Structures are given as structure tokens and as C-alpha cells.
Design a protein around this nucleic acid. Structure first.
Ligand SMILES: [Zn+2]
Ligand SMILES: [Zn+2]
Lengths: 214, 127, 97, 25, 97, 51, 91, 81
RNA sequence: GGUGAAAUUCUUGGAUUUAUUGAAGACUAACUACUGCGAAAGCAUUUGCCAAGGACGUUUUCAUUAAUCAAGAACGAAAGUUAGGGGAUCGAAGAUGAUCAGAUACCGUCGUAGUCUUAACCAUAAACUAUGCCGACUAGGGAUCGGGUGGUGUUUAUGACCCACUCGGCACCUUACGAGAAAUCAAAGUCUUUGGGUUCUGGGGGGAGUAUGGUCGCAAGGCUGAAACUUAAAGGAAUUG
């Protein structure tokens, strides 16, 4: 019988400035009171949003990104990168029978003192004037392309600190890098990352964090 | 402009219900169910009950001051039937009918790399 | 690889076995390409690589231990170190780093 | 001409009838 | 006696591959025995896409879909799926229509 | 200090109060499991050989 | 020649103490009296002095393994998970 | 068809088949002339080659082996022997 | 919670749901097929190490070194046994509320052995490549796995694909001239116009895979293995109500 709709308070999240337009919603958290209020104790609320309307795009329901809140100030709390993922629509649209499926996964230590895991998904297709039904591979080409993909995806990282790595990711440069890196086997192919996730964020880094403020 | 919430519509057999919460996910808003409407224990997942729960939830959201939602449809998942319950469509339709903006719809029914064998034994439910 | 490589070495070139002979060769300066085991004691390891630095040779840390090193050399006993004092028919000491 | 499909299931899958004076009273 | 050429299922020099469970009764069966039916229609009722469009922006944005494949068992397959004609001569049918 | 170890770690002769110089899990073949942490009001949850 | 058929080491106890007991004792007494090998000796030389105390008589030291075995499955698993967690903390 | 000149069946019918199934089995390999680009020596070599062949004096490379036929890899000299 | 209907059960001591974080052991979805490998049983996450192996190419090498087998050995699903470890889920026992009257039926919940692994043991068992082993032959058509050969080849001058041939293999459709009791079979054919070579099985059904003996196993049972006495039929394919 508390009726906490009047008790709670409105906050606005704020995405960092390694992005486009960064005002990305609001939250009803708790009452900002005395006696150890939780407004200055949450520090970890994570939000799932779409890169498309983050940038103003209008035709990408996939590649959702998630962000954790780091600090609070002025009833307007700034976030930071936590990870990214794809939607199950596009993945299970891409997947079908009479073709194969390539997957790779690296656990890489970047320039700044973070480690994070990155995935890489791929499929196969058929050249023009084709007769074959299925177009499967030879199971050694698979190991080769897995090797070169893992090499490229640990080459981009350890170098390309997370803040600019996101900015290079959101235009999807790595996919069209692979497409023309292994053009010898396939001039065009449908590659995606499909997953990134952090493990061992070491320290708050208030300095660079407030440098990338928005 | 339009303040968001997440609906978290979870539909199964002999129940379905909506759990509106903030974008973060740790501060709920008016968890309501269709099982609260009719105490028959046989129509707990009905379209009429789901629509009543939807009207109640949209009433709570409008009275609080929410205007937009992201719907997330859930089933039992894992090893279970994996299908969306029948009342979820009526629930989301009443949500649209209640004058609430809706965006970024997806399914979040969990799916494994398989393990933890199903019940029913080898022969299954021999009805 | 390394195993058939030093097999070719024991076939063609000249080697010597054991810590004492290896140290004598390093001191004489008639040595190069010291291979050490993995399970060797750290004291012996450290003084060996120190002499190796003084003599300007190349140290190789055999990823295996002792018995497998002996088998790779072809001998039927444990051997902790080898010193390749000649590889006149080989591409070992130049290719390995 | 194989005949191995008559070689898994329907004669013995617990060999205590082969070790029958062990557990069954 | 002799009902079917491929008696149970699609097993040509494989011995034994792997089992799966039925969706209805969860009976453990082999993989390719009865039917593995597709399920891709939509997440959409009696359409109401007009309702979704007026209650959305950049209207509906995805046309999102469900994707699954479900392994039936014949104890449940003919009981749920109704094909209404299983003759002798039409035992060798391959086109659903 | 069992506040400066990760979860699921396996230890022994753990102190029950800081300073007792060893109380728990010091019999032959016995250990003690770290379940959880609680950095505020600093504590740790821990599982003993008796469950 | 091969003297005993089944009892092996447990023939000293003789006809007594049951048989299900003096086969378990056999299982453990072969282990506690067997020799094993330390990598930092290289050779099969280690031997038990007492319960929990084993001694590499080449490499000339002692280790604190199990009672009747130089190592246990639980010990190996905790070694593996510590190798895991240390690597995780440092990376 | 089923009746032909088994004294000497046709060329297109006796060439397309495998080597063992012929009326008289014979080879599909040969030798060829090859010139070291570095040296002057125009030596002979097997067609379906094996482990690395190189020149006698200016030994750099002539032909690399494969599953079937080998490969000179640059256009030097391959006619006959 | 779970059902066609229920209850048994949990919960305002805050259940159910929701967000993050962690542990446990288990498994490896979708890709997964008229796909592949293996002597069988069987084998789907990544990488690395260890050895292994078929097919293809060959104008390399040995020159009958070979085909099949008693006996004697290797391997041998799951369920079980011994001792330990582990034990997340499912769950032979077992406890529980309800339906066709009851349920010791089916069903809902819980749950011991087990389900995982370590070193051994058991080894006959509804395990058909839809048919012991090795060798010659006899119709057509297509698809496809691994090679090998060539191209106005097509595609940024082999790079990736197509066309044609060929060896080996898993299978599919038709037709059987031949065979078969028929189902049906490219082997179950080339068999009374009866003979390429080799190993093992059965003479009506029950009694009976039971007695008795041997032998094996951690075990009056594995493997081997009768009779007395019996009825007149059992049995297989196919037609018709
Ligand atoms: Zn089922
Ligand atoms: Zn030692």
C-alpha cells in the first residue's frame, strides 16, 4: 500500500560520446532520499538498445548493443561499453539447410587493460552458372578460414583500444575486410561478428571516462 | 521524447502473464497475470484472461506515465515445449489497442546447446 | 621439425652430452646451440645460460623433459643437456631462431 | 549382405539373467 | 515381412548415429525416423499489422519470424498431423501438395 | 585473505575470525569452498566440509 | 615362480579378517608401497615414509601428497581450477 | 550398339577409358624436356613427378610435385623427350 | 504448479516473474543430408600432440609372398558387479493427490541405485551393408563423396565454379529378359540345360536351451548341451469377407 509510482524518481541515461546522438531513454529507479539512498548506489544497471535508432538508422532491427551505467551526476547518468549481440531473427534467417556454417571465437587482450571475447560467424554460397544443389566445403578450407579469421580478429584488437574499436565496428569494417582478405576463395560472402563480451574490466578509469562524456 | 519500458510477456500452457519493467530490468512496474481473473485452473492462459491482464497492465503504465514499450515474448524454453503460449497474441494486441507505442519486437525464448534430458523417460508420456 | 632435425645432427655432425662435457665445450668456445630440458634444476639452468651468454651461443628450451629428450637424441637414458659442437650437414642451428 | 541389425536390443540388455544367481531372488 | 525398402530410416552403412526426443510426448527416438517438420510462419496473429503500424514507428521495422524444426514421433505424428490418405501405392510420395 | 580470492576457490585452515590463526578445515583431505562475496559490510559466504 | 593366485600381498594376514576387507587392503597396500616418478627427479624413485609424506630420493626432497597415493583426484582438480583462476585473474 | 571392331576399337572409345581396362594396358605418363632458367642445361624429367627436382649445377627449382601432374610454374620449356 | 478434470506441493516468513554475478556436473542443438569414416560395437565445440588408415597418381620396388577357416586370442552398445571420485538434469525401486468405481493402470510432484569418470569383471544377447567371405560375367537412367585427366571453358593468366571422361564408394528410380511360394531380388541370377574356392549352421512343434556333466565368471548361470512323452499339425507369402 506504498504506491511507489509517486516514490520513485526519473533518471536519464546518457551514452558516451564515441557514438552518434546519445540520449537513449530514461529510467524509474528509486527515491533519492537520506539514510543510504540507492540512487547513488545502483552503479550497474545495464540497458539493451538498438544501434540503428542510436545512430538514427531505420532498417536494422539486428545488432543490438548493451551498456552499463558507470556513474551518476545531475540526475543524468553516463554509461560505458559492456558488449554487443545480434537478434535471433537475422541469425536463423541466415541459417538454413544445404549449406555449411563456420564459427570462430577469440579471447583477446586489447591495448588498454581489458580482455574480451569476440565471435565470428560465416556461411557459404554458390557461384554463378551453378548446377549443384548444396555446395558444402572440404573441412580443411574450414580450418584455414577459421585460422585467418581468428588471426585478423586478434590483429584488429591489441591495438584498436575499445573506444575506437566500437567506432570501427559500428560501420562493420571488419566484415568487408574479411570479404576482400579471403577473396581468393569467395569474392563475396556473408560474414558477421555476432557477439562480443567483456570479462575483466580492471579499473573505473574516471579520467578517460569523463573525457568521453556526453 | 517517448519514454520506454520492457513488457516481458511470458506465455505458456495453463498460464500467461506480463511483467512491465524499466529499461534496466531491476525495477518492475505492475506484474499482472491472467490467472488472477478467473479461478478455474483450466483457462489460465486464455485470450480473454490475457486481454484483461493486458488492460490492467496498460492502465498501470499509463497511470505511472509510460508511453512506449519493447515487447519480449517468452515460452518455457530449454527442453520444454518451446512454443509461444496462446494468450500472448491477445496480450500484445490489447497493448497496441490501449494506445501504447511499441517498438523493437523480438523473441527471447531460451535455447541450449543441448543437455539435461527431457522427462517422460525414453517412451514419453504414454497417454 | 626439431626431432628429425637433431636426428640428422647426431647422424652427420658432432654433439656432446651432459652438463660437464657441455660446460667444458662452452668454456673452450668450441660449442654452440645448447639444448636444455624442461625439468632441469633452475640453478644448473641459470649457470648454463649465463655461460651461454658469455660465450655468445644459442639456448633452446626443449618443451619436453628429460626422458623424451634422451629418446629424441636416440639414447636409452635420461639426458639433461646437449651441445651441438658441429652441424656440418644440417639446417638446424641457423633455422631454429 | 549384412545381418547386424538383429544384434543390439531384444535378447539381453541386462546380463544378470546371465549372472542370474547374483541379485534376483 | 517386407513393408518398406528403407525400413526405419535413411541408414546406409552407419550402424548407429544418435537419438532425439519427441516434442509431443518426448519419446526418445532416432533422428530421421518419423518427420522433422519446419516452423517458420511469423510472430503475427490474424494479421493486425495495421494495428502494429499505427502503434509503431518506422512501421514494424523487422517482419520478425519464428524459426524452428521439430522432430515428431509416429505415435504423435499421424495423430496430430493429418494427411488423410496413406495408400499402398502412395507410400512413395515426396511432394507435400 | 579470503576476500581477495575469486569465487569457487578451494582453501583450508581458514580463520573464522581474523586473528584466530586457523580454525576450520584442517583435517586430512578436507577443504572449504568460496560461494559468494559481499564487498559492502565486508563478508564472504563459504561452504564447509559438513555442507 | 608365481606363488599366490589371488591374494598377493595380503597372504600375510592369512585365512582371517574376511575377504572383502583384505582385498580392499590389497588395493591400497599395492599403492602405498609402489614407487612413482617425479619430473624434477626424472626417474621412478619416490617412496612413502609415512601417511601423507612421500620422498623423491632423486632430486632429494619430500612432498605432502595423499596418504596411500602421491596424489589424489581432488588434489588434481583443485590444481587445475587454480591454474584456471590464476590465469583468469592475471588475464 | 554392342558389336564393334574388337580387333581395333575406335580411338575415342579406347582413349577416354582408364589405363588398366584397355585391351592392352599402357601408360599415360611420359618424359619431357626442361631447361634450367639459371643454367643452360636442357635436361629430361618425369611427367608425373615426385620429390623436388632441381637443376644439376644451378640448383634452384624445376618442378613441384602434386597428386597427379607436376608444375614447372613458369613457361620455360615443356615439349617432349 | 500439471492435466480433458483435478488435488498432493510452495508462498505475504514475499512465492512466481524480472536484471546482474557465480558454482556444479552433464551435453555439444540449429548446420545434419538418400553425407562421410570405422572390422564391428560405434564416431558431430576449438586448437595442439601421438601414432593409424582407405581411395587416387605412378613407366618405383618384391617377385606367389595368396583366398577361407577348426582351435587359440583381440575388440565388443546399454543394463549390471567390485573400490574411489563426482552426483546438474532424468530416474528401474519407493512415497505421494486425482480420473475410467478404486490404481498396486495411465497421470502430477518428489526421489535411492543408476545416468559421468578412474583400474578391473561380466561377453551368449529383435546389433538385415534390409542378405558369411574371396573371385569372373549380365540392362538402362540420374544424383552424390574422395581423388585423377583436359577445356572457346565461365568468373578477380590455372585463383572459385561448369562441361566431358575415368577409378573407388555409399545410396536412389525403372525394367527384369533369369530366379523365387510370393513379398521381392542386379543379387536372393548366371542351379535338375543341376559342380569357381573356403568356413558354420537345420531336419516336424513342444518337452528344451530345461535336466546331467564339463568349463568360465567376484556368483546351483554364460559356452557346450539330451531323453522320457507327445499331438497331426505348427509355420511362411499372397487373395476374400
Ligand atoms: Zn514430444
Ligand atoms: Zn627429482
Amino acid at each position: 500500500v506504498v504506491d511507489p509510482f509517486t516514490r520513485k524518481e526519473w533518471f536519464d541515461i546518457k551514452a558516451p560520446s564515441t557514438f552518434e546522438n546519445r540520449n537513449v531513454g530514461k529510467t524509474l529507479v528509486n527515491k533519492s532520499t537520506g539514510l543510504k539512498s540507492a540512487s547513488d548506489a545502483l552503479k550497474g544497471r545495464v540497458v539493451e538498445v538498438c544501434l540503428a535508432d542510436l545512430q538514427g538508422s531505420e532498417d536494422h532491427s539486428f545488432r543490438k548493443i548493451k551498456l552499463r551505467v558507470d556513474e551518476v551526476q545531475g540526475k543524468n547518468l553516463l554509461t560505458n561499453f559492456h558488449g554487443m549481440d545480434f537478434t535471433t531473427d537475422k541469425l536463423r534467417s541466415m541459417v538454413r539447410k544445404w549449406q555449411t556454417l563456420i564459427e570462430a571465437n577469440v579471447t583477446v587482450k586489447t591495448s588498454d587493460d581489458y580482455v574480451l571475447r569476440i565471435f565470428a560467424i560465416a556461411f557459404t554460397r554458390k557461384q554463378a552458372n551453378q548446377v549443384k544443389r548444396h555446395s558444402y566445403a572440404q573441412s580443411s578450407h574450414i580450418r584455414a578460414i577459421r585460422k585467418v579469421i581468428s588471426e585478423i580478429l586478434t590483429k584488429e584488437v591489441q591495438g584498436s583500444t575499445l573506444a575506437q574499436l566500437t567506432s570501427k565496428l559500428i560501420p562493420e569494417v571488419i566484415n568487408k575486410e574479411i570479404e576482400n582478405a579471403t577473396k581468393d576463395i569467395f569474392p563475396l560472402q556473408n560474414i558477421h561478428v555476432r557477439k562480443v563480451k567483456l570479462l575483466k574490466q580492471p579499473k573505473f578509469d574516471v579520467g578517460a571516462l569523463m573525457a568521453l562524456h556526453g | 521524447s517517448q519514454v520506454f519500458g520492457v513488457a516481458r510477456i511470458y506465455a505458456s500452457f495453463n498460464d500467461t502473464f506480463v511483467h512491465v519493467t524499466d529499461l534496466s530490468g531491476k525495477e518492475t512496474i505492475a506484474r499482472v497475470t491472467g490467472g488472477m481473473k478467473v479461478k478455474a485452473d483450466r483457462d489460465e492462459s486464455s485470450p480473454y484472461a490475457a486481454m484483461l491482464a493486458a488492460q490492467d497492465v496498460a492502465a498501470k503504465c499509463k497511470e505511472v506515465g509510460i508511453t512506449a514499450v519493447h515487447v519480449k515474448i517468452r515460452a518455457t524454453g530449454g527442453t520444454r515445449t518451446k512454443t509461444p503460449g496462446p494468450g500472448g497474441q491477445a496480450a500484445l494486441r490489447a497493448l497496441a489497442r490501449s494506445g501504447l507505442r511499441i517498438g523493437r519486437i523480438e523473441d527471447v525464448t531460451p535455447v541450449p546447446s543441448d543437455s539435461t534430458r527431457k522427462k517422460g523417460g525414453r517412451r514419453g508420456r504414454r497417454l | 621439425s626439431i626431432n628429425q632435425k637433431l636426428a640428422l645432427v647426431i647422424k652427420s655432425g658432432k654433439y656432446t652430452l651432459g652438463y660437464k662435457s657441455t660446460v667444458k665445450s662452452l668454456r673452450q668456445g668450441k660449442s654452440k646451440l645448447i639444448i636444455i630440458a624442461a625439468n632441469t634444476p633452475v640453478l644448473r639452468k641459470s649457470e648454463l645460460e649465463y655461460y651461454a651468454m658469455l660465450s655468445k651461443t644459442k639456448v633452446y628450451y626443449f618443451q619436453g623433459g628429460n626422458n623424451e629428450l634422451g629418446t629424441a637424441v636416440g639414447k636409452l637414458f635420461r639426458v639433461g643437456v646437449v651441445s651441438i659442437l658441429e652441424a656440418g650437414d644440417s639446417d638446424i642451428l641457423t633455422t631454429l631462431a | 549382405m549384412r545381418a547386424k541389425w538383429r544384434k543390439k536390443r531384444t535378447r539381453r540388455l541386462k546380463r544378470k539373467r546371465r549372472k542370474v544367481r547374483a541379485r534376483s531372488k | 515381412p517386407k513393408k518398406r525398402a528403407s525400413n526405419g530410416r535413411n541408414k546406409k552403412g552407419r550402424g548407429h548415429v544418435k537419438p532425439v526426443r519427441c516434442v509431443n510426448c518426448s519419446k526418445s527416438i532416432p533422428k530421421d525416423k518419423a518427420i522433422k517438420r519446419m516452423a517458420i510462419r511469423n510472430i503475427v496473429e490474424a494479421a493486425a499489422v495495421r494495428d502494429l503500424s499505427e502503434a509503431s514507428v518506422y512501421p514494424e521495422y523487422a517482419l520478425p519470424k519464428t524459426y524452428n524444426k521439430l522432430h515428431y514421433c509416429v505415435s504423435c505424428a499421424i495423430h496430430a498431423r493429418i494427411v488423410r490418405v496413406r495408400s499402398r501405392e502412395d507410400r512413395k510420395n515426396r511432394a507435400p501438395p | 585473505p579470503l576476500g581477495s580470492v575469486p569465487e569457487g576457490t578451494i582453501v583450508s585452515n581458514v580463520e573464522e575470525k581474523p586473528g584466530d590463526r586457523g580454525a576450520l578445515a584442517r583435517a586430512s583431505g578436507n577443504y572449504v569452498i568460496i560461494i559468494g562475496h559481499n564487498p559492502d559490510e565486508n563478508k564472504t559466504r563459504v561452504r564447509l566440509p559438513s555442507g | 615362480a608365481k606363488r599366490t593366485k589371488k591374494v598377493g600381498i595380503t597372504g600375510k594376514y592369512g585365512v582371517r579378517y574376511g575377504s572383502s576387507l583384505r582385498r580392499q587392503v590389497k588395493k591400497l597396500e599395492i599403492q602405498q608401497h609402489a614407487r612413482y616418478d617425479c619430473s624434477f627427479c626424472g626417474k621412478k624413485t619416490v617412496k612413502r615414509g609415512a601417511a601423507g609424506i612421500w620422498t623423491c630420493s632423486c632430486c632429494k626432497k619430500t612432498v605432502a601428497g595423499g596418504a596411500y597415493t602421491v596424489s589424489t583426484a581432488a588434489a588434481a582438480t583443485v590444481r587445475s581450477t587454480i591454474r584456471r583462476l590464476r590465469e583468469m585473474v592475471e588475464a | 550398339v554392342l558389336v564393334q571392331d574388337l580387333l581395333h576399337p575406335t580411338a575415342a572409345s579406347e582413349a577416354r577409358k582408364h589405363k588398366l581396362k584397355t585391351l592392352v594396358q599402357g601408360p599415360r605418363s611420359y618424359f619431357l624436356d626442361v631447361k634450367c632458367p639459371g643454367c643452360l642445361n636442357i635436361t629430361t624429367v618425369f611427367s608425373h613427378a615426385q620429390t623436388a627436382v632441381t637443376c644439376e649445377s644451378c640448383s634452384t627449382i624445376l618442378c613441384t610435385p602434386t597428386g597427379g601432374k607436376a608444375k614447372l610454374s613458369e613457361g620455360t620449356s615443356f615439349r617432349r623427350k
